[PDB]
Symmetry: C2
Subunit: 689 residues, 2 copies
């Protein structure tokens, strides 16, 4: 009815998107498709798309790890490894698809709503003689095999991380740590009291000391200058373009009211007299004792000298001398620093409140989105066909996928606001910010996409019963309420699981930017350099995206086994596209380890628990509570295994062992007899000037 | 009815017990009352008991801490602070006692069961909209003041502990740590691989090394000899007593069949030869290579040298090289050691199963106890008065306190079995064993004394309705079910809160032992030494006892405010008696810190949460859910405060700061310039031979 027509409007677009890829692949000026390599007719129709599809899989793991994205091989464990894990799912689907072929063929009255002879293999006939037995026993293997596979998965991951841990160069991460909340100096000393403590304790050849001053007094204008340079080019570019043909007019309005811009040298004076003077004073200020926030960097002899010390509490109150692992110099978010510790709590509570209100004002969009999808049952009693368009025509009824596509439009703008809020909260490193943001986003979409959707789809479905209806008064709502929502997700997957990924290969956003930059009247001036500034930073959006699909599948796998065939079809294409885009062109620069896989486990395990707890609440209303023993002992053994893993393998992942540290230190000291480590570590964390 | 007569049978015994104390205080031979001091007529009726009652309170805190029980002043922070914390409740009880005098004096039908005009100030009249307002508002101060007081309490405790932390002598606890799960030696090396690892790392002047072999191969015969010495004396008294007057006969059955013993020298030969060779062989065994258990002791320069190292994970797998803080040499439980790590899990699961079955077979005792308490409603329809005894006489009806007293008899023997099971589980130190045992005991009595009692008191009360009864079919059970149980606790407190404590001063158990030892025909041979072997080790029993009383009071404070007057009356005498027993004679030696107070907080906070969750479940079934907003926001703040405390003050209590360590190390090094620390640390942890 709806799924039979929703597959054409998606495949017909995916093919066109894939064809344009091969079309624009053999171009001349747009070399962004392979911008990373130079860092240092039926012939082309049916035999031209295989130029990179089978070649992408020909990269062994060693070659991937030993290439760009040193810490990205573990990221490729969501698609490449995803299929493997999902394999056990397709294998068991190969056996449960027969109950689907042996439960749908049982015809009955089928009075669900109104004589709908469709896919209804879920609740054909209640009180099944010998049919629900398999439906209950399958839950065992549904968990036992996936956990057994995840066990080996986490084992392989830990082994490869430990191996890679012994094949790393000399980075300042293990050397330099960040110590904050130094006691307030008695208005006389700035650093005489800091170093005085690091010498009484284990000296370990205390290296240079860097006192962090108030960031957001000079860093503000530093960023303004980094931006005024682009604006300088935007203002200097008009003086080398307009006058090329003839000086006639300028842009003018460009935002606020006003006729047009006056001159160029006059606009260049704004960043000169008013630009230099303002920057000259604050640059003298940071070389003066105007404001010195209690924050600094500490180092030791080698990695072991800092790993053994940066793990305990120095003082006797957990509010002073907070020692953390400083990230790489490229990941330091120098802007949102020098924040007092007292406010860190407030910014965690106030900003949270504003978030809790967003959920209350973001409920009507779902209703407005879930009100134009399934016409049948809405326009039957109160409303009717409106003029200028006939709804009886199939061309009007096949538009059920329109809201599914329009939903994405109302979802790509809020992540930016969420990121801005998380930045306003204030943290230490961006590696943790990029993870907490996604963590908050997922829990936001959890109580809204899954728990917030059904609650709104049942009320809007039952409150439309006026005359020609059924009982529906007290109890006759929870029976068939979830199966009715699967029709929406079927379309959601086709509009987001197929086009959402295809829309990223073409890069419709940055491509227009490149075309615009191509009209900058520049021959070779930094053309090879500014064209590789934007990257492919999509972790914040991609990480919560896969978990939703995993949750939906794990929940509907036992209810609707007809959805598991339509999920891997896309997972494969996403995996190969990401494999293609990782090695060829990604421009990723944020590696700080792989400390995000346990976060996935503990968040899919709770997802499985949620599914098992929701299963016992629907099929247990038929008759006797004969199914409760299994659905109550399974989640117990589920968390028991989780606890076991958290005790066995988790501590070895987020911590730093001291046995391999000395082992690696011995070799790194026996290879290079010269010290030569205080040179690049002194001027490692500083400002541009 | 029952509480009016239960107070006489308890007070009349407490006075008799207190009088016997003063009687036996001025004795000559029984000097056990003041055995710790020599370690180096209306005149005596109304003016003789005040000889030690007001004097015990005249000991300042400095004198208590600077006396026997260095880590016992914090244990008295239970009765002393208890009353202080109660003071707030008491202060509140004074204001709420008027609502009690203004809610009970309003007479109504009072058809609870059968025209029982008694203390029924709980649910006299329906809502009224003029009385429950105060009952709902009082819950605020019920928690806010106690939390505010506990805040200052935990603050004072932390400060005094940190102060005491800088006034301790040189103990081997901070110096010697226990490292277990050393990798299995390759059948060639015993200790050559230990020092090999500790010399590549931070040397820190690695002190002597002790390899722990299989404990339960020599420890067995060591204990058999320590016991055979007592048996040797028990066999020598046979020759020192019977031949004194005349040799006539000897012992007989003595547990097993047989006429009588044969001779003395023949019984003394058992210890030697067969018992001598056995010990001779295994003593040679421990000196030779037979079984080298992977466990040893590690030391460093000073306390700081070991505190900074014994806090992280050495290896990369959290199953090898487990480093723990070794207790004092007197607390080392050498018997239950050398246990493999693989079994530690099994012993934690199997022994647990056997425990979970005990709860299923320990349910009928409660039912038998609550079968003869309130004969009113039990002997009314099916049973009647039995011959040879008339129940209509008050002398027979006043026996309601008999089961309350008999319950204690069925409760003093199971703690020993629990202790034996906890020992069989296997741990490292006794300081943790003595705490986990009490921890298990409390959770055992929690689901049985409180949750297991009411469930069994309601069923047995509702299943006795045959003819002259009321509805009692579907809903008519939760109305008045908890108020009916208060009568049982009123008697429980008088039979255990008054006599249980008084029964400890006289020491009816060890006193008989002393009288028997007095007939050993010994003039001065170690009489001053063997008479001080038994101590006053009652922490395992006393710690769970107070929490039950606290829980009952905190739960009934809002329901039945008539119980709070009858709890402090005893807490005061318990406190003074414990002060007396701590100052004069306690003979305890298990001090290993004070890391047990947070365990109390986190276990009374959950108790308060349980009370607040049980209140919303009884009075919210009357009508509208107008009380749910308060009873749902209060426990949230309760958890908000608990987490805040856990974040703020808890880490500073269980851990060892590195700031004060160096401070104390500087002084301890500046006072004694000589090293002189390898002497007493070498032969610090060894066997008797």
């Amino acid at each position: 009815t709806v799924s039979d027509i929703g597959l054409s409007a998606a495949i017909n677009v995916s093919m066109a998107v894939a064809f344009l890829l091969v079309f624009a692949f053999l171009r001349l000026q747009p070399i962004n498709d392979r911008v990373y390599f130079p860092k240092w007719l039926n012939m082309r129709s049916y035999l031209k798309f295989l130029s990179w599809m089978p070649a992408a899989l020909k990269m062994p793991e060693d070659e991937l790890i030993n290439h760009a994205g040193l810490d990205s091989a573990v990221y490729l464990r969501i698609y490449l490894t995803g299929i493997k894990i999902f394999v056990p799912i397709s294998i068991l689907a190969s056996l449960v698809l027969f109950p689907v072929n042996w439960t749908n063929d049982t015809l009955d009255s089928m009075k669900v709503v109104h004589s709908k002879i469709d896919k209804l293999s879920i609740s054909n006939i209640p009180y099944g003689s010998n049919r629900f037995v398999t439906h209950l026993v399958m839950a065992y293997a549904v968990t036992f095999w996936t956990c057994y596979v995840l066990f080996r998965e986490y084992e392989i991951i830990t082994t490869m991380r430990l191996r890679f841990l012994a094949s790393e160069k000399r980075r300042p991460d293990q050397f330099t740590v960040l110590v904050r909340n130094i006691p307030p100096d008695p208005d006389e000393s700035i650093s005489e009291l800091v170093e005085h403590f690091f010498l009484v304790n284990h000296p370990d050849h205390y290296l240079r000391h860097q006192v962090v001053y108030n960031a957001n007094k000079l860093a503000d204008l530093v960023e303004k200058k980094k931006k005024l340079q682009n604006w300088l080019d935007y203002y200097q570019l008009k003086y080398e373009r307009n006058p090329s043909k003839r000086p006639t007019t300028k842009t003018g309005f460009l935002g606020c009211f006003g006729s047009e811009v006056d001159a160029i040298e006059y606009y260049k004076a704004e960043i000169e007299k008013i630009g230099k003077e303002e920057a000259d004073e604050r640059q003298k200020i940071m070389k003066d004792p105007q404001s010195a926030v209690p924050a600094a960097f500490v180092s030791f002899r080698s990695r072991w000298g800092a790993a053994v010390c940066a793990q305990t509490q120095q003082t006797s109150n957990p509010t002073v001398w907070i020692t953390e692992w400083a990230p790489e110099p490229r990941d330091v978010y120098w802007n949102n620093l020098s924040i007092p510790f007292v406010s860190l709590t407030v910014r965690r509570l106030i900003v949270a409140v504003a978030f809790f209100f967003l959920n209350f004002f973001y409920v009507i969009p779902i209703a407005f989105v879930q009100s134009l999808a399934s016409l049948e049952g809405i326009e039957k009693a109160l409303p009717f066909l409106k003029p200028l368009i006939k709804i009886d025509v199939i061309k009007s009824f096949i538009q059920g996928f329109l809201p599914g596509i329009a939903l994405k439009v109302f979802l790509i703008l809020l992540p930016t606001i969420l990121m801005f809020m998380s930045k306003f909260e204030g943290l230490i490193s961006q590696s943790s910010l990029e993870r907490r943001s996604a963590s908050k986003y997922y829990i936001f979409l959890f109580f809204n996409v899954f728990l917030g959707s059904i609650v709104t789809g049942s009320a809007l479905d039952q409150l439309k019963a006026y005359i020609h209806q059924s009982a529906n008064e007290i109890p006759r709502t929870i029976g068939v309420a979830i199966p009715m929502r699967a029709t929406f997700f079927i379309t959601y997957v086709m509009v987001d699981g197929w086009t959402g990924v295809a829309g990223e290969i073409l890069r419709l956003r940055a491509l227009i930017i490149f075309h615009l930059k191509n009209f900058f009247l520049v021959k070779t001036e930094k053309d090879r350099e500014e064209a590789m500034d934007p990257g492919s930073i999509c972790f914040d959006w991609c990480e919560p995206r896969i978990q939703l699909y995993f949750l939906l599948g794990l929940v509907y796998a036992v209810v609707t086994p007809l959805l598991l065939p339509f999920i891997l079809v896309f997972f494969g294409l996403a995996y190969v596209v990401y494999r293609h885009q990782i090695i060829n062109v990604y421009n990723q620069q944020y590696e700080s380890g792989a400390q995000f896989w346990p976060s996935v486990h503990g968040r899919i395990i709770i997802a499985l628990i949620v599914s098992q707890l929701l299963l016992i609440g629907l099929l247990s209303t038929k008759g006797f509570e004969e199914t409760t023993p299994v659905l109550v002992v399974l989640p117990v053994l589920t968390f028991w295994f989780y606890k076991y893993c958290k005790n066995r393998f988790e501590p070895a992942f987020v911590r730093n062992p001291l046995q391999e540290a000395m082992r690696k230190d011995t070799l790194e000291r026996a290879r290079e007899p010269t010290f030569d480590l205080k040179a690049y570590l002194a001027n490692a964390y500083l400002h541009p000037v």
